[PDB]
Structure formats: C-alpha cells, structure tokens
Amino acid sequence: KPQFPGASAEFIDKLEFIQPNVISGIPIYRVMDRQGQIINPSEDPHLPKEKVLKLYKSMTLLNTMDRILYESQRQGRISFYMTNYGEEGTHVGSAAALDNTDLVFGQYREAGVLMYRDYPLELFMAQCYGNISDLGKGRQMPVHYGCKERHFVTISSPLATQIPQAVGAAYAAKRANANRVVICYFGEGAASEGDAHAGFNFAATLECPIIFFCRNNGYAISTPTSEQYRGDGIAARGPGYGIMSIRVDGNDVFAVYNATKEARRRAVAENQPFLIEAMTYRIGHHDTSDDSSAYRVNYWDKQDHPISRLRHYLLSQGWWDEEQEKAWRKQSRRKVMEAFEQAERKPKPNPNLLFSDVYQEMPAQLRKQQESLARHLQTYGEHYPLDHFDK
Amino acid sequence: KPQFPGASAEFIDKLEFIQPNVISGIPIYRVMDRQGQIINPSEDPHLPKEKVLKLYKSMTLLNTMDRILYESQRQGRISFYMTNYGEEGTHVGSAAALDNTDLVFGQYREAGVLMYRDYPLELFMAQCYGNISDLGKGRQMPVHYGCKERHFVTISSPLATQIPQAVGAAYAAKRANANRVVICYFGEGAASEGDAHAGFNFAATLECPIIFFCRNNGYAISTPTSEQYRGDGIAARGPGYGIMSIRVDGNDVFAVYNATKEARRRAVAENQPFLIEAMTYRIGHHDTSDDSSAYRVNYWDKQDHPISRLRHYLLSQGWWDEEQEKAWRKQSRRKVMEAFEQAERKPKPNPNLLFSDVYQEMPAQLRKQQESLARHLQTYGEHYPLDHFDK
Amino acid sequence: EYGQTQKMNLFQSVTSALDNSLAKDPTAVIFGEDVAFGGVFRCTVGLRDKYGKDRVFNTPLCEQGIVGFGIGIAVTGATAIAEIQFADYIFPAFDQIVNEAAKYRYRSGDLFNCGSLTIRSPWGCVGHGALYHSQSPEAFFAHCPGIKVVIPRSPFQAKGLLLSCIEDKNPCIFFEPKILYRAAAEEVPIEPYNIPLSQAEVIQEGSDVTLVAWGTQVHVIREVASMAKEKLGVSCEVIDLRTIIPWDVDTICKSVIKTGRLLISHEAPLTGGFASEISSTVQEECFLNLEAPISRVCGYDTPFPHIFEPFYIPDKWKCYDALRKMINY
Amino acid sequence: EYGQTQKMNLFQSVTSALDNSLAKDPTAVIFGEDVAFGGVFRCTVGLRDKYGKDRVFNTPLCEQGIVGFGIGIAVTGATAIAEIQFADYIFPAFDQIVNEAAKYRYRSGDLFNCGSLTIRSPWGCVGHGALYHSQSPEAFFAHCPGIKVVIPRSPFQAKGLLLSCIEDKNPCIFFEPKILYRAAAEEVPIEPYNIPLSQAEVIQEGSDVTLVAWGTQVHVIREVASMAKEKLGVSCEVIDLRTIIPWDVDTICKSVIKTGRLLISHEAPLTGGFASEISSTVQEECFLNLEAPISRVCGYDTPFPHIFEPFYIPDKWKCYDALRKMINY
C-alpha cells in the first residue's frame, strides 16, 4: 500500500496514462425543454406564480434597458456599453436562488442580478452617464455597477481579479458565522487567468462557503473556446481542486435556479465551495467596440433563448398571454425611457470629486493638487466643459 | 442534443453534482517493489547493465556531493544549499529517458539531471562558490545551476515562472521541427502558482511537445499538502486541461524512466503535453535555512529510498556487491573532495562583472556607474575584500 | 530618404512593421488575445492569412502566460512579439517581466537570454477609458534594469521604433498611444527602416526653455511652444524622449545647458512618474545652468477617472500656465 | 513614556505588534506561506497556538491569491494581515495590489474598500540574498495612488509603525528589513502604541547638510554623519523617511531650507528609485536654498548580485565620498 503523503491511492503495475473525457463531457442539467415543458416532474421547483413572473419581468426589463442603452452608445450619448443578450436566464435564475444578503462579486455581464434585487433604473443610468446621482461619483466606465445596499460588489475591468477576493469575503463570512454565501460570476475566458486558479484552490483548502458561477457562452471577444482550453470546459476543472461541480443549461432559468439553490444550501451548511458552469451563447457583440460579425447567432436567438423559453412555460400555466405581453412591453419601455431622459438631463458631479476617496482621508499633497486645479479653472475655465458639471 | 459551443456533452434531467475522487485517487505506477524486485515482467524496460550502473552512480555521486556541500554551508564556506535527498530517483530516471538535446527547465531540486548529463563537479562547485570558473559569473545564489552545452536552462528563485516559459520553448521547438521535447520540473507547492495554470492551459491549446514533471514530496517548506490543495494531488488536474496524465512511484527509477520515455515518445510524435506526477518524500530539510523538525522521516530514509531500491535490484542481477559499493563510495568521495578543494581556492570574478550582461550591450549610463566603482575602489579599496577577487 | 511611402495612421504603421518583420525573419511569431482576427485595434489585420496560423495566433486569456510563453520562445532564439491587449492589463505579467525577462541574461552569465522578445501594448488616455483603458505604466518599468521601454509619437516614428525593438537584442516593451491609432495619417515607408533606441529627438529648436515629453504628449508640448511664442515671445526647444529606458540623458542635458529651463510633462501621475528621474538627473548634471526650478506637469496622483478626464490630463493650458510661471520665476 | 518595555529584536517586535492586534481586534487574521509554524523568519511564532488555527493559517503557494484573498477579507471590514514571504516575490500580486487594492475605494465612490488590509514582507539586502532575496521594491509601489508604503529602521519603530499600518483605513505595504530581524535588540513597549504614518523623523539635528534614508540605510547615514563630523567638521542633519508614500515633504523641505544641501541614499537601484521623487520635489520647493546639487547614492542599475554584494551596496564609504564632493561643490 502506497505511503506518500501527497495522495491517497493504490499502486498500479501497468503504465496507463489518464485520458480526459472531452467528447462526452459532464452532462448539461436541464429542467425544461425549448418549448417550456418540464422534462422530469421530480425536478420541478414549483416556484409560485409571483416569483416566476418576477424572473420573467426582470429578464425582459433588462433586455429593454439593453436595447435602449446600446442605442445610446451608438449615438455617443454614453461612452461604452455591454449587453446581456442570452445571459438573462443565468442572471435571474441564480439571483432568485440566493438570500437577499448573500454577497455578489461579478463583472460585465451580471446586471440581471442587480435587476432582480430591485436596483433602480435611475441608478443603472446614473452610472452609465456618470451623473450626480451616481454613488460611484462618475469615476468608472459605464456598466461598472456596484451597490452596497444590495450586496453587489463594484465591478472592475481587470478580468478574474474578483475570484480570489470573493473567496476571502467567504472566509470572513464563515468566521463571522454570517450564515451567508458569497457568489462569484465570471466568464469562460476569465477562467484562463491565474487568479481563477488562485481562487478555486484557496476556496477548497480554506473551506469557504462560496459558489463559483462560470458563464460559458462560447467566446471571449473573438476567441472561440477551442482556443481558450482543451479540457471539458470549466466544470471539469472543479473536481481537480476538490470542488463539487455541475454543468447546467444556462438558457433554462429553472435548471439555473435548482443548481444555485442546492449549491447555496450545501455551501453554507458544509463550508465548501461549489462550481456551476452555465452553458449559454453570447448573442450580442462583445461590447460596443466590437463588431462580432468579423469572427462568427440567429440559431440561438430564435431557437434557444432564456426569455422565449420562460415565456412558453408561463403560457402553459395560464400565467401570461399576448395582452399581458403587449402591456408589459409598453410599461417597461416607458419606465426605461423615463429613467433615461432624467439621467441625460442631470449634471455631472463636481470636478473636485476626482480627488476624493483615493485614500480614505485626502493627503495634504493631494489637497494641494485639488487646489491647483481650482486655481487653474479660475483662470482658464472657459476652456473646460464646466457648464455640464455641478458647482 | 445540446448545441453549446463551450462543451461536448449530453443533457441530464436530474441534478447531480460531480464529486472528486480523492480517497482512491489516480493509482501510483510501480515497476519494482521496495526489495528491488520486478513486479510485472511485461513492464520491465530491461535497461542494459552499463545504463543501470549509470543511474546508480549518478544518484550516489549526487548524494555524496549533497553531504559535503550541506556541511560546507553549515560552516559558512558557501552561503546556501538545497539537498536532493529522495529526489535522486526522479532526477536520474527521467533524465535517462530524455534525448541528450531535449531542453530542461527546472528549479532547486533537479541537480541529478545535470549529474546524469555529466555536468562537471568543478562547475557545480564553481556556481555554489561564485568563483572565476562559474559561467554564471557568481551572480546567483548557490544551486542556481545552468548549462547551455547540456540544454539545462538556468534556474531562478521565483517559483513556477519556468512553467509557461517551458511551454513557449516547446512551441518554438515544434515550429523548428526540432524533433525535440521540453521537460519542465516543479514541486507540488509551485503548482499552486498562477503560472502553473498558465503553462498547463497554453501547452494544451497551442499543442506543445512538453512533459510537465511534478515532484510531489508532501511538503512545501513547512506546509503539508493538506494545506496546499484538496483535489487528488497534481495528476488529477491534468485531464481538466486536456492533458494526458500519470502518477508514478518517484522512489522507483524504472517507473520514472518508463513513464518519461513514453511521455517523450508521444509528446514529440503527437505535439501534445503530458503530465507526470512523481510521488516522493523530501527526506532532507527544505534548505539550509530550515530546521524541518519544527513542523514534522526515518520511515522514508530506511524503508523506501530510491538509492537503496536500485541497489537491491543491482544485487539481484549480480551487477553490484559490497566490494564495488565500498570502492565507489571511496572514489566518489575523493572526486567530490578534489573538486571542493579546487573550488574553495579559486578567486571570485572581477567586480566589474557586476555590470555586464544587464543588457546585451552596456548602456553608457551603466558604464558610467562601472567607472564610478573603479574610481571608488582606487581611493577606498582597503575597505573592500579585494584580495579574494580577480583583477 | 527611405523609398516609397504611403499614408498610414498609427495602427497601419504597426501592421506594416509587423508585416516587414514576419517577411524577413522566418522565426518571428505574433500572439496574444484576439490577435488572429486582426486585434481589437486592428494592428494585426491580414497577418494570419498572409503568414499562417502557426505564426499569428490567439492565446488563452492570461497575461502572465502570454509573457512567460514569449520569454520561452525567445529563449530558443526565435523572435517573439507578444501583445498585451491594454497597457492597464500588463500587471498580471509584472513578475514575468521584472523578475524573469529583465534578469534572464544577467543571472545566467549570458548562457541564456530572451533578447528576441518584444511586448507591444496600447497605452495612454483615450477620452473615456477611465481607470483600466487609460493607464501609462512606463514609470513602473523604468525602475527595472534589463528591459527597454519605448513610446512613439506618430506613425512614421512607431514603425521605425517598433522595428528597432523587434530587432534589439534585449526584451523591449513598446507602448502604442491608442488615441493615435486612427488619428491623422502621415507618410510611412513601405519597406523596413529603423529609428535608434535610447535616442531623443529635438523636433523644434529653441533658446529660452526646454520642453520634454513622449507619446501623444509630444503634440501637446508642440502646441505649448506655439502658444509661448505667440503670447510670450518665448522660444521653446521641443524634445520627444522616445525611449524611457535606457534614456538619452545627453540630448536632454545639452538642451538644458543651452536654455537654462526645463519643463517635463506626462499623462502618468506625478508621484514616482518618470519626470522625477529626468528632473533629478538634469538637476545633477546642469545645476549651474538652471535659471528656474525644473517643472513637472503631470497627471494628478489619483486613478484615471471616467467623467473627469478633461480635468485630469496635463493639457496645453496646464503646461502653458506652468511655463508662464517658470519664465517669470 | 509607553509603559513596561522589554528588549526585542525586529522579528520579536513584529510578533509583539501582531499579538497586540489579534488581542484587541477579534476580526483580525494573519495568513500567508508558512505562517502557521511561526514563519520562515519567526515573525508569527506562538500566534496560532494563542489565537487559533482559524486566525493564523497557511495559504497555498500563490502570491496573487494571498493578496486577492486579503482584499476579500478586508472588503467585509475584517482586518487582514497578509504575509509575502520575501518582498522579491510580491510581483505576482502586483496586479491585485495596483489595479485592485489601491483603486478599490476610489472606483466604488467609497461604497466598498479594503482599508483593513496590511501586507507585510521581508525586505532589503541580507549579505548573500542575490537577485531574489535582496530586493527593495518600494519605488515600484510609490507610483500607485491609493496604497501606503512604510519601512521601519528598528524594533521600536517597527512595532509602532506596523500597528499604525494595521489600524490605518487604507491598504498598507509594510516592508521589514530582514537583515535587522536578529540584529541588536532595543527596548520595546509590551503594550500597543502607534507611530504616525507619512511622518519623517529627524533623528539628529544638523546645520550643513541634510541626509535622508529609510530602513537599514538609516544606520548607514548615521555613521556617515559621524564620519563627516570627525573628518570634515561637517554637521549633518539625519532624517529617517519612514513612510515612502504618502511621504513627509514638509519635514524634508524644512531641513533643506535650513542646510542648503541634501544627500538621499537607498539600496534600491538609482534609475526610477524613490530618491528621484524626493530630489525633484525638494528641487521645486527649495530651489533658492540649494548650495549644491542634490546627491543620490543608490544601488547600481543592475539586478542584485550574489558574490558582488559588498561592491553593489551604497555603503558608508560611497555615501561619505558623495558627501565630501557635495560639501566641496
């Protein structure tokens, strides 16, 4: 019997390399088919009508907002945008399975989580416009959302940096006996970063109540997954770190909900990490700087979409119809446009705010720089867009 | 049938997390038992007598050198040392399976590879002493060996940095139609670094003829593997990147040789990476700054050692006996002491060499600094250990 | 001077440099995130079709891997041209750059090197890039012996400097001012040519004050020279530094000995910015010639903001106002 | 002044600081490579037994993970004291430090922060550390708004500064001069006390020249002051900078206005070293008072060598010779 401390294993007396199973990988958990039909009744979460309508209205309201803000970017009204087309089911299915106070780390494609948590349209807008209502004080590029009240840690552009951070927050939660989970979203491209290997391993060895949620939508900007990895996606990586792992149909809000709900229950009870890889397709361009037709969509959009699938389910229950659909489409457009118009008309924050929060206090030498700008604007102010900024 | 680009898999209609198999992990490939007996005749490489005596004499000569240089460090004759006690079989078993011109990247525990490649005792010594014979010009701490002639890339202290480098060299070899492999050694602690995740993934996606060789000896300084990872060691990580993987008994030179020989054959023919995790035990302290009794050995040293095991095999073939053992022990001690004495008596390199090779050419401002030192030593030279350095 | 030219913007001049490199050096490869389809700033358009998928290819999304991989290629003597998608994302690779690439030749006694590595990366402000698509990281790298850091101001400059970096026998970081990628075109030779590294360029002679900058900021100080001439009757000597390290101390000191005044400007934050190294060196070498304190007009010591960018940057008015005070000292 | 003291060397003073922290702050945890058994330099001996395995624990061998993990802990408001085993190995974490920790408060409009993070790491030469157990990385970090960088010169200084870092509401990097860990002991209060950040200390008053350094180099310039007094009859004002950023500009400028001469010294390489920022700032603020050029006596612009260390370091003779020339200028 082998005695090595590094592994628990038997001897083998024949040379055999271990081959990865990539052709038939980890299977994809589904609850409803593309026609919104429940496949296996024992798996049906039987969520109540009001909750399921919330999933649906959250997704569609996000989609409405996406359409408008994408257009706003094209007109140069806002500088940048990233859509959620196809990520709506992963967002709202997982958010609905969390406790309200569970802490969320993400990046660019998680706005539906905030939407489900009732983040005001006014605040999504304020961040994209960098106006005086933005609690982020207009400092970050658009869609870099954050909300302390809704436990949604401010997004940052460097990919994967949130992954080991989320693990640290989860360790702290364990110690605090918070009975809280942390969830951490990231794309399949971001999973190639060194920080993903850091977070996965620390979460296992330090026994942290965290859900890793990877959105695998087949592309990282122009890069297909064939160039991103050669294993069986991200889910197959989890077991190598000792992490319980699952793969789900990301266009199925119920499969997403079931897997997240169970991951959350076990992560908190057992103080162990869970990895969920949600299979989707990025229907939109990567962002507003991207024309995705350069490197590759109608299949996914008309044949397999989270919103359409849930809409079919709703119809089967008698919980929605064409009239309700029309009325909601109108009401949601009105609500988004009201927030949009208000956001565009607000001033930007005082230019003084470029100097605060660098440190908690402002160092004397920094204050000196702030004073130098004030003097500068006194003399040369005509040359600056001051009429747009708060004073 | 699922359509997602990110994975190839069937649907499943029931929620099931994938559980890591850590209790009965990837089995440990063995060819000979602890008494040097061949277990499975179909696996016996039947290496010729001269080659097997080379494996044995390489291991023992390394061990002799280790004993002397470890003592030299304790006396402050050299500043630092790291022993190879227990890594001798992994070293010489894998080196013997490589082609002479296969490029090696490593770190601190690979000196047996150089020993097998007939690296002169004088040069091991010259590097540890930083004397005028050192081609590294005395610039690095002891045991940071390198040899361009023997295709052994200079060691550096930062852990794991060589892993993605080795992959790049392997990519270049593929393009060159070198029919050469690259091998890259690293410890189980170093495998936690972000650079390990970088190298493993790039080697798979870019289809590189590389062998990753991980020495799992149960500890990284004071840290047991229970605190290093929670998966089934390092071998279980390989398949998640799409890498063919195997685990071997690192105290068995033949198991090491067989797995390396086959990895090399397939890596070159197929342009694909192979991962070999060699299970060993670090018998010595981590280095000369370490008293390992602070955190944990006699079992491994008397019950399961690579040198003892090979010695038993040699006896069974009639290829060694007590007289030969005595004579070799004497001859090897004499050879190491001759190199040791010569190394201690050589001057150190000219202090001017602190300035060259920073860039290929020396920038004018750097030459100015070199001139400032020359002037300085002209006036204040009595205060410097100049009598020890070449002029 | 250099044969047939054609109008090129800065991204096109980069493509031209890269094309010329792959044509004449069969070892050369180009890799990084999204380079295969032509890159997110178009710098590699056409090259994969022209030279082959084994020579222009995408990597996984991992900066530390890109640089470690590049170093490995270079260790075999093959030319490795790595791309980092924005300079802001070079930091995951900082260890590979500083501890490995810069030290590779020295620490091996020249038994091994990675001289044939070049890392190219978009750099500098772009109007709305905010914290992570605006940064100017050159001062971070300036404190690392063993690497070269090079920043062009125009398409003609970019192609000649990039060719020099690719051919230089030391690991080079080439920062491409992204706001210039599609700015005005200028004539650029179609065939290969070199501009020397560690050589500043005096682009306008002057007698009252020396102005030093690099990248897009060169165009700012050129405009400041014009403003000073018109409004103050002050003659400014305008210098593009071009190479951050090793830098051209002699050209700068010669100018300041002549004028007796120096203003250095860069987008990067003031504290620890590269203006500090130039100012302190000029002070040591030209002390007796200094009519007024050396002025540094830099970004403020904050992260780079989104909505406040117009107020953050060391623009022509900030530079002009500093110059006015220095002339009056 | 501070209650009962006992003789402590620098490693013991660090243990004392950490002990005092865990005792008074139930949120505080200490983690990194090999900290559980007491650390490779003994700084955490006894703390796991005293405070529990959930509070003093080993991580996997991954610097980028250690720092990202620390930031996460700090995001919840819990005090996170991360160790990086040698300052030379801080570079894998450079992205987490520069792009994340430093920018966390600003970029969120103060909705989130990691003020309760402190990163402590052994620093500076040690006689035979060569390239990777000798480095002084402070200038790399000095160019990053949003972090504080702090370096003590003695056990009493180390405990008071480290307590201040741990309690400061901003991410701090505390560099511990490892050659001092087991050097001479001095009296150190057993109970907690604080020394303010961003405050230099004039440790010896003088009238002819100002000398500035930090870490072990403070002891070098103190000896240089003695040599200057004895051999030249020159009165040196000796200043320990202590905090690299934000630095105490006022204390330095006040001294130079008085003396008219400044020599700054550090082990780190000259080019892009922090002496450049001090020299350029002093030049701007004290221009009219400068009797001679500000001198920088630094490490050469090379990697840190093994066998050549005695020739590399800016020792008392190099500093003295510079001072002699400056006094004579």
Ligand SMILES: Cc1ncc(C[n+]2csc(CCOP(=O)(O)OP(=O)(O)O)c2C)c(N)n1
């Ligand atoms: C460290 C770093 N490198 C590169 C980028 C540029 N970049 C922004 S998004 C992106 C692709 C991310 O792909 P993935 O993680 O799959 O997410 P998706 O956009 O598909 O949802 C890249 C390369 C970045 N933001 N951070």
Ligand SMILES: Cc1ncc(C[n+]2csc(CCOP(=O)(O)OP(=O)(O)O)c2C)c(N)n1
């Ligand atoms: C980036 C980095 N961090 C930390 C160290 C300090 N260190 C030197 S060896 C070592 C343990 C390495 O363990 P492992 O990789 O298992 O190799 P072994 O010593 O057991 O053969 C550590 C933490 C280092 N050299 N590089």
Ligand SMILES: [Cl-]
């Ligand atoms: Cl981005």
Ligand SMILES: [Cl-]
């Ligand atoms: Cl080490």
Ligand SMILES: [K+]
């Ligand atoms: K992020």
Ligand SMILES: [K+]
């Ligand atoms: K290494």
Ligand SMILES: [K+]
């Ligand atoms: K180069």
Ligand SMILES: [K+]
């Ligand atoms: K702090």
Ligand SMILES: [Mn+2]
């Ligand atoms: Mn993706």
Ligand SMILES: [Mn+2]
């Ligand atoms: Mn180990």
